Structures are given as structure tokens and as C-alpha cells.
Amino acid sequence: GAFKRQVSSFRETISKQHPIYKPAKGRYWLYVSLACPWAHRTLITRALKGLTSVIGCSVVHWHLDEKGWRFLDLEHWHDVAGGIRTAKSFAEIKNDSQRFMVDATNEPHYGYKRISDLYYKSDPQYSARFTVPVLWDLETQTIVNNESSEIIRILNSSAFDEFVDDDHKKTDLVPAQLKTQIDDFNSWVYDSINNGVYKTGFAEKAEVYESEVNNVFEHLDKVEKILSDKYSKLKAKYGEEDRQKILGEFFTVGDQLTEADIRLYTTVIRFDPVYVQHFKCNFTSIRAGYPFIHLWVRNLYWNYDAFRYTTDFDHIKLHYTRSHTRINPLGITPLGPKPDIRPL
Amino acid sequence: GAFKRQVSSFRETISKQHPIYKPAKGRYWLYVSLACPWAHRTLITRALKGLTSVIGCSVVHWHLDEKGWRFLDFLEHWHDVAGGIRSFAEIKNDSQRFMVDATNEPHYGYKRISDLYYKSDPQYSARFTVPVLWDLETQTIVNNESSEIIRILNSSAFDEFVDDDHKKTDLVPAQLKTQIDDFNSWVYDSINNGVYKTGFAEKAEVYESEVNNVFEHLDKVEKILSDKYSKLKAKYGEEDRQKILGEFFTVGDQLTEADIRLYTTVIRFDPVYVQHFKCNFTSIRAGYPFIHLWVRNLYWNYDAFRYTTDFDHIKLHYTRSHTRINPLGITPLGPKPDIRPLLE
């Protein structure tokens, strides 16, 4: 009765040496959902690496029906969130809602209504799931890569350095000095937290649900310990009153913002708004039960534009509650918790 | 898509002057579910008024199927505060653990509470609800309205059969009667039944109206208790926690029926109503400090409350019986713990 995530099929890279996919401005596109934590990784990374004008973005609807992610039928393409803005209750919003630049964008290059149209163009024999994110090549009309862990490495690589400014080129979310630390952390966070919440919420037998939920909270406890130890050291170094200096080095790995933080964030920012109620990951919440994770996630959300302005809590809450009929059969979106993220 | 609770049909009383239903030991029986907050009112009141050996009790299974509450196929059990009732994945909906999932119906061997209803009135055609206050002599339902059963138990009706300490206990003192009734009225509509109008709503517009109403009224209760705590802190000093708590109640300065009626909802709120009925702006433990102190004082410090509160029956009943809310019948393991200790 367990959930098994399928392996992603499109696994190519972009580099000056690549025979097909070489770096250029105006060539590649990023198709995402704002509700998906995997695709969220790519949006955050695109922003932190200064690539919003280099790689355009479009956004599928938050409602996921049986035919897969769908679209509605320049300032937006090159925006951190593809131009989506949260509207100024959920009950009046139906699953077929058509608020252009609120629920979704269009697909601007071909007018496709379905993300499956891109998959079939790339591989007419494709037979797997039509997932987001998709890194798309406009020249060959193919999917370069649809594995979020690899897309973020492509984005952080030197590939696009000619087309970005001096400050962003220098940002390195996977420094060699921390690479074993990042890769370790990522491995167990993936299995027990990023994917752990899905193995918990999609379980169809309680035995699997219980095993997986225990494993989620056991690993949140590990993260919380790492952060608690780091906070102790920073408080000794700077004094607890100098909160600003403390937060400037308050990260999961090392003393700087890395990929490990990005990958954790996309799960943690969804945890209280969705995963507690909807995936039954409910021993406690981040805000009530995990002070150091809670501080860490609020620092990233409130103080980093790449996190705040790619985080759409309406897409998050509506996607899960409205799409997963075997969890929420009537599609009624809970109004709580309030607020979606507490202030810092 | 709104939930309209039926009016209870059996509304008679027991008294010395009554032509039919006079008080006696060994004559009346109380049939309950430990999951039901309405029936829970009657168990608490039965204990507080010292009536456990006067009025026997039997307990239906926590699983509620389409044919209604059911029994499984002893002196100490019948006269116990909870009828003798002593991970969830291993417990199936057809679980048959005698004295754990349910008791038997010991007078007639009925397998269904509907059997008692049809015995009393062969033309009955509403829902077969708990609690039931049953007369063994006429084989009828005296009263199936929890708000009236607790008045019967509190009345002078059974005073000849209890000790003097219990006889003097009065859960509806005259000086507080009107305030008890007025508090009870809005707590009923907005909290006791408010959580059910919220969780059983099948249209989002009704869900949202009712959930906002629940939290608006919990705010009202919290204000009452905060003001009362402030007065007690002045009367006694914050250090005298035992003297403060000895007067820390919803109406006046003593335990009343108003506390009992609020408690059966509040004790279920974090274990069930937050996740399952989507009453989730916040939780009691995180969001309502004065309600949280009040309910922990009742649970831990009054045996009539603690030893009638069965969190397995509570969690299993709701999550395993409400298929249109929880289609796969998977009981969340959290929140942990069911009720927090009263840490000073």
C-alpha cells in the first residue's frame, strides 16, 4: 500500500561542451507549479543565481486532474514566480477557476493546454507521469531535464555565467568545501522529510502511514538538533541580542546559505499549511514543536526575496486539498493554520 | 451541504411523583459510547453524583457503521465509571476485543442499539443515538437527550441511594442556574455542535462559516477564563496555583454542568476536531492558554473526567467511521500527547 515515486526520465545537462544543449539567453524555459516543492527548488535557485531574465518561467494551474498539470487558455516570463500574484476564504474558488496570472499562466510558446503536450513533443512514446518541474529547450523543442535535484545543479553551475551579473555568478549554493556535508544532509532529508511526507500522506495502509510518520518526525528531530547546536555556537560568538549577526550564519550546513537549505525549505514551508492536516504528519507542527526549524524557516521566508516571492500559499493549500480525492474527497480546503507563516 | 442535528425523541424524567418512572437502585441503565461527547457528559455526571452502583453502564463499539452503534457478544464492570472498558494500524474496524472495544448489551443480548429503540417504540424512524437512559421495568427509553439526562442525574431523584457527600454535590446551583443556561446555549451552538456543523459540512461555504464561528466562540470562552484567572491571581497570588485552580471554572467559582458540557468538546479538540473536522486555525494547546489550563486541571485532577476519557475510542470512532471525511480509515497518530501534563 506504499507510495513509490517514479524516477525522472529526462536527465541531460547544459554546458559549453554539450553536443546539443549549450548555454544561451532566450533558449531555455522552466515550467513549474507553485504548489510543488520539487519545482519550488528550481524557482528559488533561479532567483538566487540571477537567472530570471536568462530562463523564462511559466506556471501550471494548482488543480491537478486526471489529465495532468494544465495551463490557462515579458515582465511575467522573467519574474521570479512567472508573474503569478496572490489574489487580494477559498470557498468561492472552484477547481476550474480561471483567474489569469493568479491561478496559472498560459503556455506562451505553443499555446499548449496541458503539460503532457510538452512531454509528447519531446518523446512521442513517453509513458510515465507528466511531472513538474520541466527544463525545456526552445531550439530543439525537447525536455533537457525534469529532475529537480539536477535542475538546481545546472542552474548553480558555471553554464550561464556569461549571461548573469558579477554578484550572481559568484554565488555558489554547492561549494566544494561543504559538498560532502551537503550531500549527506540532502540524502537523509530526501528520504525521510522531502519524500517522507509523501510516503506518509499517500500511504493507503495504516501500517505504512505509521512507519513513515514516525520516520518523518525522527528526522525533523535530527534537523532541529543540528540547528540548536549551531544557534548555541552563534549566540556565544555574537550574543543573543545581536539576532541579525546570528541569523546571517544560521543555516543547515556550514555557515552560509546552500542547496541543503533550499531543498529542506520547500518541505518545511508547506508543513504547517498542508502536511500536518492533509498528510497527517501531525505529532506536532513546526511552529509549536520545532523552535529552531521555525526560526530558520522564518529567516529564509521573511529575509530572502528568492524564498518569499516564490512561495504561494494559495497554490500550496489549494493544490493538495483540491487534487487528492482519496484524502479529501469533497475538496474542502481547511482555513487553518492561521497564519500560513508566523512573523519573525 | 449543512449538518442539521435531529431533535431527540425521548424526553421524559425520573422522579418520586412520576406515575411511571420512579427512582430506584437496579432499575435504570446508561448505554453510551466513550467516543461520543454527548454521552461523555452523562458518564462524568454519573461519577460526580456517586451513581455508578445505582445506574449500570454498558458501552457500544467505537466503530459506527450504516446499521448504527453496536455491541460485542461483570458486577464491577456494570458499576465502573466507564462500564469496565480497559499504534492503531493493527486494530481493524471489526475488532472484537471484549471489554476493550465494547461491552455486551447484558440484559437482552442485543447486538444493536437500534434493538433498544425498536423495543421502546416499534415505529421509531430517526437515528439510533447515544446516550440512552433505559428503564429495565417498562423496557423503554426514558430519555436520550444528554442535556436532560445530566439534569436527571443531578436532581434529587436518586438521593436515597447515594452517600451524603455526593447527595450535596450540585452541578446546577440556583445562584448560577441562569448563567449556566446562558453559557450552555451559545457553547452548544458554536462549540459543542459547532465542531460538527464544521466537520460534517459538505459545501466549503458552510465549512468556512462554521469554523470561523467555532474560533470566534472559543475566543469568548478564553476571555472569560483569562479574566477569571486574573481575578484569582489577585485574590491569591500567582504562586498559590492550587488555590487558584480550586476556583478556576467557566461559571462562578465552582465546578458546574457548564464545565462538563464544554469539557467533552475541548478534550476531543486537539486529538480529533483539529485534523478530522478541520477546526484548525490553531489548537487548544498552542492557541488557547486559559482553556488549556482549565481542561488540563479537569482531566488530571478530577477522576470523574480522567477515567471516563478514552482517547482510543475517541480517535478511532471519528476517523474510522466518517468515510466521507477520511475515506481510507487511517487514524492519525498525532497530536502527541493526547493531552499534555499540567506542568507548573
Numbering used by the authors:
A (entry chain B): 11 to 83, 95 to 109, 115 to 370
B (entry chain A): 11 to 83, 94 to 106, 115 to 372
List passages from the publication reporting this PDB structure.
Glutathionyl-hydroquinone reductases (GHRs) belong to the glutathione transferase (GST) family of enzymes and catalyze efficiently the reduction of hydrophobic, bulky glutathionyl-hydroquinones. One of the most studied GHRs from a biochemical point of view is the protein ECM4 from the yeast Saccharomyces cerevisiae (ScECM4). In this study, we described the X-ray structures of ScECM4 and glutathionylated ScECM4 (ScECM4-SG). Besides the features that defined these GSTs as members of the class Xi, ScECM4 possessed a tremendously elongated loop between strand β2 and helix α2 involved in the dimer interface, two more spiral turns in helix α5 that make it 45 Å long and an additional helix α5’ with two helical turns.
Crystallization of ScECM4 was assayed by the microbatch under paraffin oil method at 278 K. ScECM4 (41 mg/mL) crystallized by mixing 1 μL of protein with 1 μL of commercial crystallization solution (Wizard I n°10 (Rigaku), consisting of 20% (w/v) polyethyleneglycol 2000 monomethylether in 0.1 M Tris-HCl buffer, pH 7.0). ScECM4 and ScECM4-SG crystals diffracted respectively to 1.45 Å and 1.68 Å according to the CC1/2 correlation coefficient. ScECM4 exhibited no GSH in the active site but rather glycerol molecules. As expected, the monomer of ScECM4 exhibited the GST fold and dimerized with the pattern specific to GSTXs. The N-terminal domain (G11-K196) adopted the thioredoxin fold (β1α1β2α2β3β4α3) and the C-terminal domain (K197-E372) was found to be all helical (α4α5α5’α6α7α8α9). The typical features of GSTXs were also present: a long N-terminal end (37-residues), an extended loop between β2 and α2 (V70-R140) and a unique dimerization mode by the helical domain. The visible N-terminal end starting from G11 was found to be partially surrounding the active site in ScECM4 and in monomer A of ScECM4-SG. G11 was hydrogen-bonded with E230, at the C-terminal end of helix α4. The loop β2-α2 (residues V70-R140) was the second distinctiveness of ScECM4, and probably the most striking one. The side chain of S115 and the main chain of A117 were hydrogen-bonded to the side chain of E236 in the helix α5 of the other monomer.
